[PDB]
Design a protein around this ligand. Structure first.
Ligand SMILES: *[C@@H]1O[C@H](CO)[C@@H](O)[C@H](O)[C@H]1NC(C)=O
Ligand SMILES: [Ca+2]
Ligand SMILES: [Ca+2]
Ligand SMILES: [Ca+2]
Length: 109
């Protein structure tokens, strides 16, 4: 049910870009604090890609706007949905959009 609430925005394709999640009525970004390959793997597999090619910090794919919804995302790397990962409370971050996390997933075009 969670695969709908996550998109990769502003990449070369829907397999890559700034991570945006849908929560409480609106799209919001994810902070890079502790953004690593475990989290990237979780995000890329909940969307249907076989693996993660790369994670990016410091708004690799430009700065989102509006709400940063997640911070301190600490996935084990095994999860079915990013929201099953340990992370901040919704909307409680110590970040700015300059820190919006991005990813590139494994894709075969
Ligand atoms: C992502 O889009 C933003 C503006 O929406 C832009 O500043 C940035 O350069 C883009 N990233 C790439 C890799 O083109
Ligand atoms: Ca940071
Ligand atoms: Ca933080
Ligand atoms: Ca992490």
């Amino acid at each position: 049910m969670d695969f709908t609430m996550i998109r990769l925005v502003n990449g070369s394709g829907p397999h890559q870009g700034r991570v945006e999640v849908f929560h409480d009525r609106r799209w919001g970004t994810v902070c890079d604090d502790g953004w690593d390959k475990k989290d990237g793997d979780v995000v890329c597999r909940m969307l249907g890609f076989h693996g993660v090619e790369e994670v990016y910090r410091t708004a690799r794919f430009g700065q989102g706007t509006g709400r940063i919804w997640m911070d301190d995302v600490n996935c084990k790397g095994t999860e079915s949905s990013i929201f099953h990962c340990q992370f901040s409370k919704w909307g409680v971050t110590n970040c700015g959009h300059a820190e919006d996390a991005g990813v590139t997933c494994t894709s075969h075009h």
